Design a protein around this ligand. Sequence first.
Ligand SMILES: Cc1cc2nc3c(=O)[nH]c(=O)nc-3n(C[C@H](O)[C@H](O)[C@H](O)COP(=O)(O)O)c2cc1C
Ligand SMILES: C[C@]12C=CC(=O)C=C1CC[C@@H]1[C@@H]2C(=O)C[C@@]2(C)[C@H]1CC[C@]2(O)/C(O)=C/O
Length: 364
Amino acid sequence: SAEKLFTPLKVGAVTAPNRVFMAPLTRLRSIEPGDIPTPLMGEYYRQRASAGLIISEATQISAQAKGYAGAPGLHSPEQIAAWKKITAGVHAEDGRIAVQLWHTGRISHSSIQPGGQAPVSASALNANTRTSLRDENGNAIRVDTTTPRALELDEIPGIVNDFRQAVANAREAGFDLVELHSAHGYLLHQFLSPSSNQRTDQYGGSVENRARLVLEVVDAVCNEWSADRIGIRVSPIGTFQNVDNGPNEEADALYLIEELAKRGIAYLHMSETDLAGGKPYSEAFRQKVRERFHGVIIGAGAYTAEKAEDLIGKGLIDAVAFGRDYIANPDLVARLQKKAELNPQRPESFYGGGAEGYTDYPSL
Ligand SMILES: Cc1cc2nc3c(=O)[nH]c(=O)nc-3n(C[C@H](O)[C@H](O)[C@H](O)COP(=O)(O)O)c2cc1C
Ligand SMILES: C[C@]12C=CC(=O)C=C1CC[C@@H]1[C@@H]2C(=O)C[C@@]2(C)[C@H]1CC[C@]2(O)/C(O)=C/O
């Protein structure tokens, strides 16, 4: 029963009974055509309802936002109807669930874009990585990303509106909170990073300009619903999927965080490392972040329970989001509380497929 990991925490409009959160995890098992959540996905989330808070797999705010075959959306009536069943399942088990909303930007492929056209981004620069599509048999396959088209200035308001509309849809779908995906090299992060943003208008250049889009989105969704329903995920230190954070990452991160604090949003979710190597956050930096944000702070990235307890005990973060351990342990909370062994992970089934390696992992 660790120490503080199993104590309640007020997270915006809801109250988590523990600080063991389920990180957003793309599993690519949605129905196509339609990018529709499935009953299987509903079962998967229901099995993990004991989490202090479940943060859903990244979900499209629009069809244009799609970058992976199998990722769900929250823009169509069918998607809203399917998500409604999933959130109800989680609530039936007394859990809480937030929907992570994204626009993949340049991490996409023309074959899954509307009209088969090139994807969009801050600038016309290829992501230089491989996204996941589906072959003729419906199996996940890695394919090089398509070079994007730079969004025209007059197209930006539309992007902001898509985020706003998706949040309105999330409210109807029964989600408890929404998490804006402003990390890991996706659209919002593409604007935030100098490496992927070479714009010469007000959306490029200074950190103020680079953060303009994400802050416009934050304001739009706070106005649409309520600030205490809004969370945001950032990965401001280091490099993620080829997108770094510039030569002044620390200062730029604090600027963004101070701006986010002004909106009084529910939480700040910090993704500290990418799947590969990554420089550890200094306690000094954590302190700088803590004193600038007055909401819940969630730490994530190869966390150990011990590390979570250490940082929560030091008053630097409030909760921890576990990714892969949640894939393999539906009842991770109980296991960590009883200090029980965990099920082994099967990475081969992280993406695509069906029930195997998804609803496959037993609870105690
Ligand atoms: C299979 C897989 C899918 C992921 N999908 C997402 C996602 O959709 N959105 C996101 O922000 N991060 C995503 N991540 C990152 C996780 O949220 C988490 O931060 C990461 O797994 C590192 O923590 P861990 O060591 O506890 O797994 C993904 C990671 C994995 C392994
Ligand atoms: C975890 C991840 C990272 C951050 C995020 O927000 C969402 C995801 C889900 C998809 C993952 C992605 C990666 O880290 C890169 C992967 C693993 C991709 C699927 C195929 C992939 O693009 C890879 O094979 C390219 O090398």
